[PDB]
Structure formats: structure tokens, C-alpha cells
Ligand binder design. Structure first.
Ligand SMILES: C=C(C)[C@H]1CN[C@H](C(=O)O)[C@H]1CC(=O)O
Ligand SMILES: C=C(C)[C@H]1CN[C@H](C(=O)O)[C@H]1CC(=O)O
Ligand SMILES: [Cl-]
Ligand SMILES: [Cl-]
Ligand SMILES: [Cl-]
Ligand SMILES: [Cl-]
Ligand SMILES: [Rb+]
Ligand SMILES: [Rb+]
Ligand SMILES: [Rb+]
Ligand SMILES: [Rb+]
Ligand SMILES: [Rb+]
Ligand SMILES: [Rb+]
Lengths: 254, 254
């Protein structure tokens, strides 16, 4: 009846609220994922306790196949749900359950406006403009695993020189795009958020692939199917679209 | 044991193959969904028999609350899987299990080229151009249930005059668009297929909602999650993308 929820700070999904005094408990947070959790809890009738994931990671596997991050929290039954922009992937689905997606997206490219670059193949065929992705995220894993020649070429480039083209987190990637001649391979929903707020950046090309974010649960959880039904309800009533517009829309671009 | 797969003829998902002699068994069929089934068969290691759904319906509930179509075939355990452009909806997910989506799409508008109509609100604020949907499909249901004012208005129009603006199937809708002053509310992936083949037709506006097609299984089926993992594998390898290109590409229209 009180669910323990693992999450991670990531704009505009989960952010610290602004207050004149110190904040405690669920009141520390706002964002799209908090709104989602409120809606799910209303539909399904549960209380919840939001806990930042202690290692600050989403969930990836090492060499020994051991997991970290929110994925490992679910595997170890230290949380009932993970509510975050947690990409639904083949490797994660083998070890946890996800609801159906509450948002659909794809990898694309964040770069500057008004350049000759139109596609990933435009990046793949040159070496002057650097490009990469968040290290150990689902986008990086996409490239590492791809057998498409263009994407193999890109992976060879990203992984060269001790992964100097990769970044630790999205904000580092964004600053690298704004300052240097660098393109970031980034989930398209994050790109939309960014380009609403940085009028000199743009998405280049379309989506390279198609995937979703889902609510994570331990394998076998009874909540996964209940949360899926609740998500479908919210989408069909237009609520998920309204929640996206609320958190994404910026102050406009000239 | 060989799995029974329920499906329905719908271009370019499931179509009768062309041959000079009578065809039998799985050899009767080709199309995107047959390709998908072959790939799922090869990942998961099952044999399968494809069976057309006897009532030729996808799955809707009547006034008594009784289901029909492929949804009912699963409910009654007369099929193990349904592989078709079967829309993942709140009402259906209550009664069957769907894999995660193999295709994402949304409702949009099919109409003639060259007109000043640009959106669903352009339709809704007028009476001269007729518009509708396939009766008892998930698109009609979206309009029937919507509490958004524009879609409420459009539903009043569609349901008027004993639903004369509605059509029994997509081909009837397409011919009505081609011949009369009529717009069809249709799933975007089917709009994409139709406009690559009839050059006088176009999509009007973008996608009014977001949803997916998934493989249906009876509640409780062990195949549901195994099929989800296989779909994620196929997506991440670029196979689903290649299969869509194979079946959608038209070579005749500007
Ligand atoms: C914000 C980041 C590190 C997360 C968000 N979804 C992806 C994941 O769930 O792995 C990561 C982004 C990416 O890999 O581009
Ligand atoms: C071809 C039709 C009758 C199917 C395809 N998906 C929807 C379904 O699964 O309900 C229907 C289309 C629609 O309602 O626009
Ligand atoms: Cl915390
Ligand atoms: Cl699922
Ligand atoms: Cl033949
Ligand atoms: Cl048959
Ligand atoms: Rb403060
Ligand atoms: Rb799973
Ligand atoms: Rb290759
Ligand atoms: Rb700059
Ligand atoms: Rb279900
Ligand atoms: Rb138009």
C-alpha cells in the first residue's frame, strides 16, 4: 500500500522544487514523472515514497553481467517501481519487467542550427566534427551493438581514443555541443526539451530507431500490468500529451 | 506443440500471395506480419499454423459486453497468438495480454491533395466536407470516448444520421475519399501505405494521439514476455525498420 519508488534527477522528469526553506520527502521533487506518479496513484489507489537511486545510475551491465542503478534496485527488490526516463531495452527486459511505454521516442542528433549536416551518415563519413553519446546509456549500447555499417563506423569513432568523444551525462553533452564543434546522439524527447530552451541548437535528421520509456518493476510484480492499464487510460484521455506540453514548452524562439 | 496464430487480411500486413495454382496453409499468405511471425518463430523456436479469424473482425465489445474478432479467439483460447495491426488499447488490454509494440502510430486524416484543410479542427468547424472512420475500430472508439471538445464535436457529426459518415472497412473509406468530398480518420501507418500508392491523396495534419500495434496473447500466456523480448531484439537490430521499408515503399507517387 505504500510503494517504494526509485528514481533519478533528470530535467524535466524529476527535479528539485524551488523553495525558500529546506525540503523533505516527496515534496523535494517536481516534474513530469512526479505528475505521472500522482496520476497513477490516483487511478490505482497506492501511496508512495520516492527515493533517489543511491549510485545515480539508470542501469547497465558490466563485463561480469552484474547490474547497477535503478535496474539493480528492482532486481534486488529494494524498490517496487522505477519511474524515470528508463529506456525499454532488450537487455533490461531480460532482468526486470516494464509497463507499456508512457512516452515513445528514438535516438537522434543534437547539433547547431544552420550547418551542412543532415543525417547520421553525414557525421559517419567525416572526422572533423566530433560526435558521441552518454557513456553506458541505452544510446551508447545501441551503437556498440549495431551491425549496420554506418552505425558500426560511428561506434568505431565514439569508442576510439579511450572514448574521448563520449560524455558522462546529458548536461555535459549539451555544453560540449554549445561550445565546441560536437554533435550529441541523444534521445529525441530530451532533444525537444533542449531545443525549446537553446534557440541555436536543433535536432538533425529524424529518429534512427524507435523505443519507449516504461515504469520498471521487479520481474513478476503484480503492479506492472495494472500500471500498463493506467498508462493506456492516461494516453487515451489525452493526459499524457497535456503533461508533456506542460513540462516541455519553453519561452519561444525568434 | 504448433501454435495457432489468428490474423486478418489487411494490406500490407497480411495478404493472399499471387500464384497460378490454389494455395494451402501458411503458403496462402505474405506481408509484414508474416515476415514478423517468421522472425519470431526463428528467435523463439516454435512452429505455427496461421488461421484467418472466422468472423473477420479485430475485436470490439457489443452492448452485452461480449467480445468478437481476434480478441475473442484469444479470450476463448482458440488461438495462441494474434499477429495483425491490432491496436493496443485500454479496453483490449483489460481482457488479453499484448506484447510491447512492434509498430508505433497515431490517428491522422486521409484526404485529397491541394485543399486548404490543414487539421482536424478545420474539419470539425465545418459541415460541407464529410468525414468519418471505420465503424467499431479503435479510431471510432477514440472519438466516441473523447472528452476533448473538438473530438466531441467530430463524434456528433460521425454518429449522426445513423452513422452514415462511417464506413465498414478501410477500402470503402479510401474509395469514398477518392470519389466524394470526404476525409477518413485512419491510422497513420495505413495512411502512409495508401498515399505511396494513390498520388491524389495525402495526410492532413499530424498524429492526434499515440499508440502501438502489439502481438496479442491470452491473459496469462508465457509467450507474451518472450515475444516482447524478441520484438525488442528485432527493433534494436534494425530488422523491424527494414521490414517496414520492404512492405511500404511505393515507386509511383511524387
Ligand atoms: C538520461 C540518460 C543517461 C538516460 C535516459 N534514458 C537512457 C537510458 O535509460 O539508458 C539514458 C540516455 C541515453 O542513453 O541517451
Ligand atoms: C484495419 C482496421 C479495422 C483496424 C487496424 N487497427 C484498428 C484496430 O485494431 O481497432 C482498426 C483501424 C481503425 O480503427 O482505424
Ligand atoms: Cl532520496
Ligand atoms: Cl507488457
Ligand atoms: Cl508459386
Ligand atoms: Cl484460415
Ligand atoms: Rb532553498
Ligand atoms: Rb521481462
Ligand atoms: Rb555491416
Ligand atoms: Rb557558442
Ligand atoms: Rb492484460
Ligand atoms: Rb492542406
Amino acid at each position: 500500500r505504500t510503494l517504494i519508488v526509485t528514481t533519478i534527477l533528470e530535467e524535466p522528469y524529476v527535479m528539485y522544487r524551488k523553495s525558500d526553506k529546506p525540503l523533505y520527502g516527496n515534496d523535494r521533487f517536481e516534474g513530469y514523472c512526479l505528475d505521472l506518479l500522482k496520476e497513477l496513484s490516483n487511478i490505482l489507489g497506492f501511496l508512495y515514497d520516492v527515493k533517489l537511486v543511491p549510485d545515480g545510475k539508470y542501469g547497465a551491465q558490466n563485463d561480469k553481467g552484474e547490474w547497477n542503478g535503478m535496474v539493480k534496485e528492482l532486481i534486488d527488490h529494494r524498490a517496487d517501481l522505477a519511474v524515470a526516463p528508463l529506456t525499454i531495452t532488450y537487455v533490461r527486459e531480460k532482468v526486470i519487467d516494464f509497463s507499456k511505454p508512457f512516452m515513445t521516442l528514438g535516438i537522434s542528433i543534437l547539433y547547431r542550427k544552420g550547418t551542412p549536416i543532415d543525417s547520421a551518415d553525414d557525421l559517419a563519413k567525416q572526422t572533423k566534427i566530433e560526435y558521441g553519446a552518454v557513456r553506458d546509456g541505452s544510446t551508447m549500447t545501441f551503437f556498440k551493438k549495431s551491425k549496420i555499417s554506418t552505425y558500426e563506423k560511428m561506434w568505431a569513432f565514439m569508442s576510439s581514443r579511450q572514448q574521448s568523444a563520449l560524455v558522462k551525462n546529458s548536461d555535459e553533452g549539451i555544453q560540449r555541443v554549445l561550445t565546441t564543434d560536437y554533435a550529441l546522439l541523444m534521445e529525441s524527447t530530451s532533444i525537444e526539451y533542449v531545443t525549446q530552451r537553446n534557440c541555436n541548437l536543433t535536432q538533425i535528421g529524424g529518429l534512427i530507431d524507435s523505443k519507449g520509456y516504461g515504469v520498471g518493476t521487479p520481474i513478476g510484480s503484480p503492479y506492472r500490468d495494472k500500471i500498463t492499464i493506467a498508462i493506456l487510460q492516461l494516453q487515451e484521455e489525452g493526459k499524457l500529451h497535456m503533461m508533456k506540453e506542460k513540462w516541455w514548452r519553453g519561452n519561444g524562439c525568434p
